[PDB]
């Protein structure tokens, strides 16, 4: 069925534009409908952004009206944001929508002058059921994905939270709770993701 | 532009039990039709339009009515009006499930051979599927209480049980982890008689 899938940098520099594209599969943009941006603050505050509809028409938030475009290809069906001069207010995650109803996945964009950093990830070693992880730290910026046995392995899983360090790069574990007979005949590995910087960390956790 | 508000940034709810979430409009949403819509955002995921759920209300107060309460209904709650230009959102509300005490298991693990080479040493304290949300994490090296040098990050409310977990994490050099031995996680919690302790001896 329809849906959203959205690309562009999660790091943007300060003062600079950012540029999202949202790739509409199986629904062409052109023939109904209104394509929305919409962005989450930290702190979870929603903020409609503006739209294109489906004849190219569109409509933006007064609060933006001189910084924001929407634009779009009906020939590769996908639409665009940009947003001139960002400033560290304009960190959020970004959605395009078709409608209330149909949501992309949604990408975070950090405003900074950092520059993107893939992660280290570390074993969490097990030392009826054991549990085990991964700790996946200093990266830059926002987020990791973290999966295990490439999505095989889903229950009992608990990925953290980031957190800032002090050194400005972010930390988080995953853990899964995993059979403790299974330990010796059984491979555990986590994936990780950092679309920022085009990174994907594979590491196998193994009893110490 | 309409102003929503949402007063309540978070519900408590019995499981099993029915909750309101109330929603209200600087501007009345009718036009007999009323432009008013309720999203859930449940953890990690964008928000999702929405028989157990209902929606009421004149047309500056609205409510979302949730009936008999499942572990699967946490998440935070928003009212969006689609009345006009610009379209705006309340603040969001927490459905937070209260359980009954549910004490954490405990693991620790030591620093990977792989960190060791950087000259950082992560020693972590995994408290899984706790309830309520309140623990206390002390640690310890060579039996000294350590302080500064650790972080605590939680879990939102887990889907399935209406738990939460947690893990701590110990920062240290490498060359002050190899001066010291024994590394001990000691954590208190409601459901716990007794202060429960994990411990590792280096290498």
């Known amino acids: 069925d329809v849906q959203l899938q959205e690309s562009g940098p999660g790091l943007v520099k300060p003062s600079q534009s950012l540029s999202l594209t949202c790739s509409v599969t199986?629904?062409?943009?052109?023939?109904?409908?209104?394509w929305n941006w919409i962005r989450q603050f930290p702190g979870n505050k929603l903020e409609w952004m503006g739209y294109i509809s489906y004849d190219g028409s569109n409509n933006y938030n007064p609060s933006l009206k001189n910084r924001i475009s929407i634009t779009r290809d009906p020939s590769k069906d996908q639409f665009f944001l940009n947003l001139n001069s960002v400033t560290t207010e304009d960190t959020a995650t970004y959605y395009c929508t078709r409608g209330s109803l149909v949501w992309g996945q949604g990408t975070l964009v950090t405003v900074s002058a950092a520059s993107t950093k893939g992660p280290s990830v570390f074993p969490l070693a097990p030392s009826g059921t054991a549990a085990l992880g991964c700790l996946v730290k200093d990266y830059f910026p926002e987020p990791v994905t973290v999966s295990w046995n490439s999505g095989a392995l889903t229950s009992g899983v608990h990925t953290f939270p980031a957190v800032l360090q002090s050194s400005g790069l972010y930390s988080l574990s995953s853990v899964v709770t995993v059979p403790s007979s299974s330990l010796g005949t059984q491979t555990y590995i986590c994936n990780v993701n950092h679309k920022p910087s085009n990174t994907k960390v594979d590491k196998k956790v193994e009893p110490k | 532009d309409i102003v929503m508000t949402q007063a309540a940034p978070s519900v408590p709810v019995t499981p099993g039990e029915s909750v309101s979430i109330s929603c209200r409009s600087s501007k009345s949403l009718l036009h007999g039709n009323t432009y008013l819509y309720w999203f859930l955002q449940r953890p990690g995921q964008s928000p999702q339009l929405l028989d157990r759920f209902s929606g009421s209300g004149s047309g500056t107060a609205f409510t979302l009515r949730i009936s008999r309460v499942e572990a699967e209904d946490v998440g935070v709650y928003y009212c969006?009006?689609?009345?006009?230009?610009?379209?705006?959102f309340g603040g969001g509300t927490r459905l937070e499930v209260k359980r009954t005490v549910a004490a954490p298991s405990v693991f620790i693990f030591p620093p990977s051979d792989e960190q060791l080479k950087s000259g950082t040493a992560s020693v972590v304290c995994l408290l899984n599927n706790f309830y309520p949300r309140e623990a206390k994490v002390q640690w310890k090296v060579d039996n000294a209480l350590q302080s500064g040098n650790s972080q605590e990050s939680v879990t939102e409310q887990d889907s399935k049980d209406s738990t939460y977990s947690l893990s701590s994490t110990l920062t240290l050099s490498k060359a002050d982890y190899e001066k010291h031995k024994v590394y001990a996680c000691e954590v208190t919690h409601q459901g716990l008689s007794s202060p429960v302790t994990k411990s590792f001896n280096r290498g």
């Open positions: 969006m009006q689609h009345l006009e230009y610009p379209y705006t």
């Open positions: 199986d629904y062409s943009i052109t023939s109904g409908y209104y």
